[PDB]
Curated annotation (Swiss-Prot), chain F:
Protein name: Photosystem II extrinsic protein U
UniProt subcellular location: Cellular thylakoid membrane
Region of the whole protein represented: 38 to 134 of 134
GN (gene name): psbU
Organism listed in the record: Thermosynechococcus vestitus (strain NIES-2133 / IAM M-273 / BP-1)
Membrane topology: Peripheral membrane protein
Subunit structure: PSII is composed of 1 copy each of membrane proteins PsbA, PsbB, PsbC, PsbD, PsbE, PsbF, PsbH, PsbI, PsbJ, PsbK, PsbL, PsbM, PsbT, PsbX, PsbY, PsbZ, Psb30/Ycf12, peripheral proteins PsbO, CyanoQ (PsbQ), PsbU, PsbV and a large number of cofactors. It forms dimeric complexes.
Swiss-Prot record, chain G:
Entry protein name: Photosystem II D2 protein
Family: Belongs to the reaction center PufL/M/PsbA/D family.
EC number assigned by the record: 1.10.3.9
Designated gene of the protein: psbD1
Note, other: 2 of the reaction center chlorophylls (ChlD1 and ChlD2) are entirely coordinated by water.
Species this protein is from: Thermosynechococcus vestitus (strain NIES-2133 / IAM M-273 / BP-1)
Membrane protein topology class: Multi-pass membrane protein
Swiss-Prot record, chain I:
Membrane topology (Cytoplasmic): 25-35
Residues with PTM N-formylmethionine: M1
Self-association state and partner proteins as the record states: PSII is composed of 1 copy each of membrane proteins PsbA, PsbB, PsbC, PsbD, PsbE, PsbF, PsbH, PsbI, PsbJ, PsbK, PsbL, PsbM, PsbT, PsbX, PsbY, PsbZ, Psb30/Ycf12, peripheral proteins PsbO, CyanoQ (PsbQ), PsbU, PsbV and a large number of cofactors. It forms dimeric complexes. Part of a photosystem II (PSII) assembly intermediate complex PSII-I; crystallized from a strain deleted of psbJ, it forms monomeric PSII before addition of the oxygen evolving complex. PSII-I includes 3 assembly factors not found in mature PSII (Psb27, Psb28 and Psb34).
Name the UniProt record assigns to this protein: Photosystem II reaction center protein I
Ranges annotated as spanning the membrane: 3-24
Superkingdom of origin organism: Bacteria
Species: Thermosynechococcus vestitus (strain NIES-2133 / IAM M-273 / BP-1)
Transport found in the keyword field: no
UniProtKB/Swiss-Prot annotation, chain K:
Taxonomy, superkingdom: Bacteria
Source organism (scientific name): Thermosynechococcus vestitus (strain NIES-2133 / IAM M-273 / BP-1)
Function statement: One of the components of the core complex of photosystem II (PSII). It binds chlorophyll and helps catalyze the primary light-induced photochemical processes of PSII. PSII is a light-driven water:plastoquinone oxidoreductase, using light energy to abstract electrons from H(2)O, generating O(2) and a proton gradient subsequently used for ATP formation.
Quaternary structure annotation from Swiss-Prot or TrEMBL: PSII is composed of 1 copy each of membrane proteins PsbA, PsbB, PsbC, PsbD, PsbE, PsbF, PsbH, PsbI, PsbJ, PsbK, PsbL, PsbM, PsbT, PsbX, PsbY, PsbZ, Psb30/Ycf12, peripheral proteins PsbO, CyanoQ (PsbQ), PsbU, PsbV and a large number of cofactors. It forms dimeric complexes. Part of a photosystem II (PSII) assembly intermediate complex PSII-I; crystallized from a strain deleted of psbJ, it forms monomeric PSII before addition of the oxygen evolving complex. PSII-I includes 3 assembly factors not found in mature PSII (Psb27, Psb28 and Psb34).
The protein's name in its UniProt record: Photosystem II CP47 reaction center protein
Record's subcellular location: Cellular thylakoid membrane
Similarity comment: Belongs to the PsbB/PsbC family. PsbB subfamily.
Length: 37, 34, 32, 153, 243, 97, 176, 32, 35, 137, 51, 335, 34
């Protein structure tokens, strides 16, 4: 097979990781109360 | 108390899954040569 | 009982650090 | 038990199936108990009790003959159960009756032989096919077949 | 006439004999000559299980069900005296025979409903004044329905009535009042109703044929749960002889 | 109240003597000359309202009646219990050596 | 005297139902497989280094070339099983791992049976079996086999306990 | 809830199987 | 139900024929050298 | 701990008189008992009818008494039901039926006495084991 | 008493000399020691059920 | 088209297929897909099965109260015995699931396919020019499934006595087997455990000896595995150093130096041992059981002096006396 | 049925956590230049 030429690499910088996690964790702090209801 | 049984797992996977996502990327980014 | 295995492992890895990674040459065996 | 005054035809066993007589999957009257699995057994001693629908409750009720009673007793106490050291009976039995049915000896000996021979078959057939085409002694270091085939990858 | 081999495996063995379309006669009763039934036989055709109307009592009906076991349903070899009565009626009184067969049928839900389809201790009767047995000469009576499983039967945990464990030995320090019902086995005994209505007579050989309908309760499982009401429809064949 | 009729029966005469209306046939093998012939008659001849009613089984030879009279002290009688009589359990209750 | 040790463990500890004993066997059983399977793969994937049929003599005690086609073996299994080795160094380390790990697990399970901290029952199962008399699994069945093993053995197997179990107390099915 | 958990893991092992057989690293000769 | 029997039977015949007519097709031939 | 002649002293007849077997008769009986009984009476039980055993007490309450050499011997010649009210020589091995149970043909009065002696001696050695079944194995 | 080894154990009652006097039977068919046949009774001293 | 069928046969037999669908495969692939697909559904949703023919259904599927460890596919009814019970033999599926129909559909297709799987392990070896016999190693584990799934049932008179398809269901097969045959006391089973124990043993021996005598070609902080390239000419370990060590552990002549003789032994041992274990189950399928030393050693008076053989009998009686609670109506267990 | 409440989450994290571990590595390996 021929190495498909439509692929690029993927990236996530450290700051994005942080901004990401901050969002996941707090949403979790916001919705857990309603999940346990 | 009288809470929901699935609440714990709903909260656990709600945090783990997407966090595990980001982390997989960040680490694979971080280790890209040059 | 699990730690025993660690001892046997790490100990060995200390007395055989040299031969770790593999061995090499000659063909001496029987004949002091 | 029939001699003790029990009505075999209507006796109900622990499970509610029929201590002495029950029905097979296609309707025929057979002996009850774990023996329901052997309802395909036919034999001189037992046939005269069979009717057009299987065991007949009337013959069983008054046509059982003594020679049959002792035949059933003989065969009951000579089932093909025994140990290697020839101790007739169930594995938990006691020593005394030194016996192992000829039918057990024959059957086992011949299953072993029959088996190993099937291995023998596979073995000698596998050798013959490699011998013919000619590689039953190794892959030609030079022309290694696999090496001329595309990578399945 | 078919020997055993001529029936084996055909399922034919679980079928009460039949009379031809001709045989629609009448058999005579001497009333001064004892008679007996040399062979009564009952073949089920349908098993209907009355459904529990849920809490909303709205009147419940019987529903068909699939026969999950196989062709092992028929009762055969029934026998007893067919005494003639003062008023000229006839009452059959069974003595012995393959008078019961454990049957199991499934339902809409998937629920298996086991019953001990039987006619033990039958006491069937007819109309008063019945000189000769004509087509449709109704027989009606009761019988006994003994517990499905007998005294010695042990549940999956070893508990039994005549034998077995005293309690839930798997839960050594659990409260017992709640488990009461399932540890203490009870042996149920009940009555049943059946009616054999003739359709084919044959005074010649004295062998009548017909169809029956009987009702009884199903297994209560050593009294662990309530029994279901069952109705059973099929056909029968009887051999009347002076004797 | 749910009770195990059998474990309860063991608190009565049954449980102390051969019950002519319930006890299984093999029980008669513990007394001289009762087993085969008589035990069958006793069991076969339905329930009894009183131990003596056994002496009344139709046909009993004069000698049998003699023997019966001798062993009456070992018999009793109680309400017929279905759990113990159903299934023909009195001719074979699933117990052997 | 060892077979009773086995029977005992079934009967009293219901050892066969233990996650660790299982791993144990998966390893010993699985280890006796690698053994057999690797051996045959080698003997029937050999190069010809002799003119005889008995290819045993055709072996170079003094290294040099691989004596069997590692490349052919790979393709064989890769087509019959779907998966196949391709790194003798790993294939051989794997062979050390499988049975040594298995026995280690079977040990832990026993270290727990010392305190009697066994894997005897499944509570959810027992609870349903109590309330409902028609629920039956191959598990409940087994537990009854254990009861019998314990009741009929305990007497002559633990003499110091001067056990006396009246015939009437001995658990037994019908007829047997 | 338990049934779902048992079937899920099973379904996951079969998925693994697939990928392992059909998406392994093609096994390359000599050069490496 | 009597149908399924028929179908199953057909289906098994197919494959069993495919099998016999297979090794029959000069199978010894198929292999690296001597054929 | 041995098979003394003290143990081999078993009741000969109903009137108390006894006989003393010898280690030869014993072994011999034991061999004969295996040759023509074990088949169904292994260990003192009765496979084709577990309700009647060879326990001495069981034989005591038999009818007539079969708990002595004389008794068992008669039995091996003309067998009866526990109440004696019926001869069963047709479905039970015995001398009067050796044509039907060949194993009983060789058997001579000397042999019958040994077999009988064995039955009274065994429970003396084994005890409860002899009568009961698997419970005692 | 129940030896630690046993998950489940039978109810057997003996006197001082260790003679089996009463028990809870499995197969009642021939029970000689059922609590019923023996008139077994129980009394308590000290505690909730005292007296 | 060089000729369709001519082509078909070239594909089937093609050695260029990712998975070698062979001639044997044409039978294998379908039978194995049926066995597998029916099993998975059964194990998950099948309803209770009257395994012992006494109308006492044993539910063994997940959705009906089982977990992975307890759950299983239950054997066909005993009412059925050895009779063939194809779906088209039942008034309905409801009837078929109750008498354990799925069991037969599974065992038959599996045993069928697992054989062809052997037939295939030959074929591919042929199309590739390699010596046969690998398939002969696989004859042992197969000969076992056969013994446990078919021989034993034929011998015992019913498929209901075949090993169940589940974890606990298997322990049941074992515990009961032991009680009725006293297998632990049978030569063939012992040879079986020697082969299995031995196998695992040797598997560890080889595995270690070799792995421990690998020629160094890797860094101190690099997987020692990389020191091997797929498609090497020379060996990756010093089989002379290996033998040098092992010969000194025990003693020289008690150690292998011929890799070919080593590997033959390595294969021969387990396969031969398991062959006997399979012949054990196939032999005790006709009631020729293990040694019965019950009450062998007796003292001077005649008293019975117990041996461990007796303590084993008690444990066996417990199993005998309790298995199949309600299935027996008579004294002797002849079935 | 009458199972353990934590069984679900115990099984979930028992599978997720280590799987997430391996995966983080494999992907960061896989994306290393050269
Ligand atoms: C990778 C390569 C692997 C290669 C593996 C090769 C394995 C080869 C196995 C080969 C052969 C197995 C042979 C079995 C022979 C059985 C002989 C036998 O049954 O003979 C039966 C006789 C009789 O036993 C006697 O049986 C007797 C009585 O029966 C009776 O006799 C009485 C009167 O005498 C009464 O009449 C009584 O009622 C009646 O039942 C008495 O009870 C005696 O007391 C009792 O001792 O046998 C005895 O005594 C026997 C004492 C036997 C010890 C047996 C060991 C057997 C197998 C061991 C395998 C070990 C493997 C180790 C491997 C290690 C590393 C690999
Ligand atoms: C699959 C399953 C297949 C099973 C096949 C089972 C048996 C095949 C048996 C052939 C036996 C020939 C036996 C014999 O002649 O048996 C003779 C005796 C028999 O003893 C007699 O046994 C007799 C009775 O049997 C019988 O007699 C009874 C009545 O007396 C009953 O009729 C009963 O049913 C019937 O079978 C009597 O009891 C006698 O008194 C008693 O003395 O036993 C013995 O011989 C025991 C001999 C043991 C030999 C052990 C060898 C062990 C290891 C060898 C390793 C070689 C390794 C090579 C390695 C190479 C490379 C690694
Ligand atoms: C690829 C091989 C294959 C094989 C070997 C089998 C084999 C079997 N299946 Mg199966 N099956 C398969 C694929 C296969 N199946 C597929 C793909 C499906 C999905 C549809 C099924 C679905 C299925 C079901 C649903 C059932 C089976 C069942 C069975 C068993 C049935 C027993 C029987 O009566 O039929 C055997 C029939 C014969 C032996 C007769 C064939 C005779 C042939 C050789 C010759 C006929 C002569 C011909 C007319 C002359 C030739 C002339 C020439 C000029 C061409 C059997 C072991 C049943 C079962 O498991 O019961 C327990 C069952 O219920 N199968
Ligand atoms: C809905 C439904 C159906 C649900 C569930 C169904 C169900 C019942 C599932 C059961 C599964 C289950 C839970 C089982 C429990 C047992 C289990 C998995 C325990 C795991 C934990 C465990 C044992 C830990 C430590 C012990 C240990 C290391 C075991 C290892 C086991 C193992 C994988 C062994 C390897 C076996 C094997 C086939 C190796 C093949 C190797 C290879 C392909 C050989 C071919 C080959 C040979 C050569 O010589 C050469 C040269 C080459 C080149 C080559 O290729
Ligand atoms: C849960 C979330 C899982 C998220 C995974 C995201 C993976 C991104 C991979 C990527 O970008 O790769 C990019 C890489 C290669 O990337 C290239 O690498 C080169 C050097 O070799 C250079 O660095 C190139 O610049 C770079 O682009 O390709 C892959 O990773 C294919 C990965 C397939 C991963 C499947 C994971 C499946 C997990 C299943 C269940 C998990 C629980
Ligand atoms: C295995 C099976 C798996 C099944 C999985 C099924 C579903 C999975 C779903 C996973 C989702 C993961 C989403 C991650 C998104 C992410 O990382 O984005 C990261 C992005 C990317 O941002 C971009 O990153 C790029 C490089 O990667 C470049 O830097 C771009 O320039 C930049 O814009 O983030 C945003 O856009 C963030 C907006 C964030 C706003 C955050 C507010 C946070 C507030 C936190 C706390 C507040 C408290 C208040 C208290 C009072
Ligand atoms: C010809 C007639 C054929 C008739 C077949 C009938 C099957 C009936 C099964 C039934 O009634 O089950 C009834 C059962 C049991 O349901 C359980 O019953 C238990 C008590 O027995 C408890 O009450 C449980 O809580 C309850 O869940 O089945 C189900 O719930 C089944 C869901 C089944 C989903 C099946 C999918 C099959 C998919 C096949 C291929 C997929 C791709
Ligand atoms: C027809 C096909 C029929 C069945 C197909 C079964 C396929 C299983 C695939 C397992 C893949 C393992 C893998 O890729 O390993 C990859 C690894 C390592 O693989 C090695 O890696 C080395 C580098 O580190 C080199 O690349 C070697 O060449 C390479 O072989 O595994 C093995 O070698 C495994 C041998 C495994 C034998 C497994 C039997 C497993 C049964 C598992 C689960 C059963 C669940 C049942 C549930 C119900
Ligand atoms: C009643 C039956 C009804 C059946 C209906 C189906 C008919 C047949 C096939 C098509 C259906 C899809 C099949 C998927 C194929 C595949 O993945 O392999 C694709 C590869 C690629 O090659 C290949 O693919 C080539 C083409 S290409 O890559 O598609 O371009 C093609 O030319 C070549 O011949 C081929 O080998 O094929 C093979 O190597 C042959 C595979 C055989 C199948 C295996 C079955 C094994 C069962 C095992 C049991 C366990 C598993 C249980 C799972 C539930
Ligand atoms: C509760 C619930 C749920 C859940 C579920 C889940 C979570 C699932 C998952 C799932 C998954 C995650 C799945 C997966 C799958 C996979 C598959 C299905 C695969 C396959 C494969 C194959 C098939 C391959 C191939 C092969 C092999 C391997 C071998 C050989 C042969 C062949 C070739 C065949 C839902 C949401 C629905 C809804 C309702 C509820
Ligand atoms: C007791 C009952 C006995 C019944 C016997 C029934 C026999 C029925 C058919 C016998 C058929 C022989 O059939 C003939 O075999 C040869 C191989 O030898 C096939 O030839 C085949 O093999 C070659 C390779 O050798 C392929 O390249 C070719 O495409 C293929 O067709 C013929 O195409 C086929 O027609
Ligand atoms: C090559 C190392 N020597 C060696 N020797 C032996 N000898 C026995 C007897 C254990 C097979 N085994 C091995 S490991 C299969 N290796
Ligand atoms: Mn499953 Ca062999 Mn214990 Mn009779 Mn049933
Ligand atoms: Ca309901
Ligand atoms: Cl059962
Ligand atoms: Fe190797």
């Amino acid at each position: 097979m021929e190495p498909n030429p439509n692929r690029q690499p993927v990236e996530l910088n450290r700051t994005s990781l942080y901004l990401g996690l901050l969002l996941i964790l707090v949403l979790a702090l916001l919705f857990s109360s309603y999940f346990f209801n | 108390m009288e809470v929901n049984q699935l609440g714990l797992i709903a909260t656990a996977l709600f945090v783990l899954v997407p966090s595990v996502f980001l982390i997989i990327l960040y680490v694979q980014t971080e280790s890209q040569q040059k | 009982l699990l730690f025993f295995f660690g001892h046997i492992w790490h100990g060995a890895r200390t007395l055989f650090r040299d031969v770790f990674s593999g061995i090499d040459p000659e063909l001496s065996p029987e004949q002091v | 038990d029939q001699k003790l005054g029990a009505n075999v035809g209507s006796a109900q066993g622990p499970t509610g199936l029929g201590k002495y007589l029950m029905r097979s999957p296609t309707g025929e009257i057979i002996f009850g108990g774990e023996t329901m699995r052997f309802w395909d057994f036919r034999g001189p001693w037992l046939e005269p009790l069979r009717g057009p629908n299987g065991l007949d409750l009337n013959k069983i009720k008054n046509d059982i003959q003594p020679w049959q009673e002792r035949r059933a007793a003989e065969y009951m106490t000579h089932a093909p159960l025994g140990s290697l050291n020839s101790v007739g009976g169930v594995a938990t039995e006691i020593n005394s009756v030194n016996f192992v049915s000829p039918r057990s000896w024959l059957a086992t000996s011949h299953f072993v032989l029959a088996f190993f021979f099937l291995v023998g078959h596979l073995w000698h057939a596998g050798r013959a096919r490699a011998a013919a085409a000619g590689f039953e002694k190794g892959i030609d270091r030079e022309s290694e077949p696999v090496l001329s085939m595309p990578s399945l990858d | 006439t078919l020997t055993y081999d001529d029936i084996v495996g055909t399922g034919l063995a679980n079928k009460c004999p039949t009379l031809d379309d001709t045989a629609r006669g009448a058999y005579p009763i001497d009333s001064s000559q004892t008679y007996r039934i040399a062979r009564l036989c009952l073949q089920p055709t349908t098993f209907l299980v009355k459904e529990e109307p849920k809490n909303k009592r709205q009147e419940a009906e019987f529903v068909p069900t699939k026969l999950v076991t196989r062709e092992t349903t028929s009762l055969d070899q029934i026998q007893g005296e067919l005494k003639v009565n003062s008023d000229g009626s006839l009452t059959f009184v069974e003595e012995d025979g393959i008078d019961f067969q454990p049957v199991t049928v499934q339902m809409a839900g998937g629920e298996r409903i086991p019953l001990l389809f039987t006619v033990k201790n039958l006491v069937a009767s007819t109309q008063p004044n019945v000189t000769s047995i004509t087509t449709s000469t109704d027989f009606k009576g009761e019988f006994n329905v003994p517990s499905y499983r007998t005294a010695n039967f042990l549940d999956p945990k070893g508990r039994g009535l005549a034998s077995g464990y005293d309690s839930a030995i798997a839960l050594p320090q659990a409260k017992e009042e709640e488990l009461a019902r399932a540890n203490v086995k009870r042996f149920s005994l009940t009555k049943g109703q059946i009616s054999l209505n003739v359709a084919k007579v044959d005074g010649r050989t004295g062998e009548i044929a017909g169809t029956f309908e009987s009702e009884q309760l199903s297994d209560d499982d050593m009294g662990a749960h309530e029994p279901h009401e069952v109705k059973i429809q099929g056909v029968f064949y009887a051999s009347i002889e002076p004797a | 109240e749910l009770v195990n009729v059998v474990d309860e029966k063991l608190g009565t005469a049954y449980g102390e003597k051969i019950d002519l209306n319930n006890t299984n046939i093999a029980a008669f093998i513990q007394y001289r000359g009762l087993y085969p012939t008589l035990a069958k008659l006793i069991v076969k001849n339905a329930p009894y309202e009183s131990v003596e009613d056994v002496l009344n089984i139709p046909g009993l030879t004069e000698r049998q009646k003699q023997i019966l009279r001798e062993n009456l002290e070992h018999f009793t009688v109680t309400e017929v219990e279905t759990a113990l009589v159903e299934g023909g359990d009195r001719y074979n209750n699933g117990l052997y050596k | 005297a060892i077979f009773r040790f086995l029977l005992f463990f079934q009967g009293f500890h219901n050892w066969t139902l233990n996650p660790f004993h299982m791993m144990g066997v998966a390893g010993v059983l699985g280890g006796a497989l690698l053994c057999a399977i690797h051996g045959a793969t080698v003997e029937n994937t050999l190069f010809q280094d002799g003119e005889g049929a008995s290819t045993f003599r055709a072996f170079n005690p003094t290294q040099a070339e691989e004596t069997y086609s590692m490349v052919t073996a790979n393709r064989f299994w890769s087509q019959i099983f779907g998966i196949a080795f391709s790194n003798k160094r790993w294939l051989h380390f794997f062979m050390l791992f499988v049975p040594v790990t298995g026995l280690w697990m079977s040990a832990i399970g026993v270290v727990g049976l010392a305190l009697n901290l066994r894997s005897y029952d499944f509570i959810s199962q027992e609870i349903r079996a109590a309330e409902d008399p028609e629920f039956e699994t191959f598990y409940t069945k087994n537990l009854l086999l254990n009861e019998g093993i314990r009741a009929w053995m305990a007497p002559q197997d633990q003499p110091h306990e001067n056990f006396v179990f009246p015939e009437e107390v001995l658990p037994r099915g019908n007829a047997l | 809830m338990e049934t779902i958990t048992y079937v899920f893991i099973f379904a996951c092992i079969i998925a693994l199987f697939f990928f392992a057989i059909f998406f392994r690293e093609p096994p390359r000769i000599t050069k490496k | 139900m009597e149908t399924l029997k028929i179908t199953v039977y057909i289906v098994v015949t197919f494959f069993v024929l495919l099998f016999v007519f297979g090794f029959l097709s000069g199978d010894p031939a198929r292999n690296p050298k001597r054929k | 701990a041995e098979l003394t002649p003290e143990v081999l002293t078993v009741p000969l007849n109903s009137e108390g008189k006894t006989i003393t077997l010898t280690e030869k008769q014993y072994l011999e009986g034991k061999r004969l008992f295996q040759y023509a009984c074990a088949s169904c009476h292994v260990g003192g039980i009765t496979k084709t009818n577990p309700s009647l055993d060879l326990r001495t007490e069981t034989l005591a309450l038999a009818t007539p008494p079969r708990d002595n050499i004389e008794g068992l011997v008669d039995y091996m010649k003309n067998p009866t039901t526990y109440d004696g009210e019926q001869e069963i020589a047709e479905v039970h091995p015995s001398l009067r039926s050796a044509d039907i149970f060949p194993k009983m043909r060789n058997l001579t009065e000397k042999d019958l006495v040994a077999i009988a002696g064995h039955i009274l001696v065994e429970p003396k050695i084994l005890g409860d084991k002899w009568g009961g079944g698997k419970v005692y194995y | 008493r129940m030896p630690a080894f046993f998950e489940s154990f039978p109810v057997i009652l003996t006197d001082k000399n260790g003679v089996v006097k009463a028990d809870i039977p499995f197969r009642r068919a021939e029970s000689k020691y059922s609590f019923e046949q023996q008139g077994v009774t129980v009394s308590f001293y000290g505690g909730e059920l005292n007296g | 088209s060089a000729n369709l069928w001519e082509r078909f046969c070239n594909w089937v037999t093609s050695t260029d297929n990712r998975l070698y669908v062979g001639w044997f495969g044409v039978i294998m692939i379908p039978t194995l897909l049926a066995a597998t697909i029916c099993f998975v559904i059964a194990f998950i949703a099948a309803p209770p099965v009257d395994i012992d023919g006494i109308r006492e259904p044993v539910s063994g599927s997940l959705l009906y109260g089982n977990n992975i460890i307890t759950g299983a596919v239950v054997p066909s009814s005993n009412a059925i015995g050895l009779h063939f019970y194809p779906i088209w033999e039942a008034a309905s599926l409801d009837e078929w699931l109750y008498n354990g129909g799925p069991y037969q559909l599974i065992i038959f297709h599996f045993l069928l396919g697992a054989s062809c799987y052997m037939g295939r392990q030959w074929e591919l070896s042929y199309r590739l020019g390699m010596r046969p016999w690998i398939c002969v190693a696989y004859s042992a584990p197969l000969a076992s499934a056969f013994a446990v799934f078919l021989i034993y049932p034929i011998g015992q008179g019913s498929f209901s006595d075949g090993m169940p398809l589940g974890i606990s269901g298997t322990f049941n097969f074992m515990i009961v087997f032991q009680a009725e045959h006293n297998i632990l006391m049978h030569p063939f089973h012992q040879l079986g455990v020697a082969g299995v124990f031995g196998g695992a043993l040797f598997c560890a021996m080889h595995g270690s000896l070799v792995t421990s005598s690998l020629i160094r070609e890797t860094t101190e902080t690099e997987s020692a595995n990389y020191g091997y390239k797929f498609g090497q000419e020379e060996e990756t370990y010093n089989i002379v150093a290996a033998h040098g060590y092992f010969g000194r552990l025990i003693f020289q002549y008690a150690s292998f130096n011929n890799s070919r003789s080593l590997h033959f032994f390595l294969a021969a041992w387990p396969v031969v041992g398991v062959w006997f274990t399979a012949l054990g189950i196939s032999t005790m399928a006709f009631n020729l059981n293990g040694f019965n030393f019950n009450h062998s050693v007796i003292d001077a008076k005649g008293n019975v002096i117990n041996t461990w053989a007796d303590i084993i009998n008690r444990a066996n009686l417990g199993m005998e006396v309790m298995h199949e609670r309600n299935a027996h109506n008579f004294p002797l267990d002849l079935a």
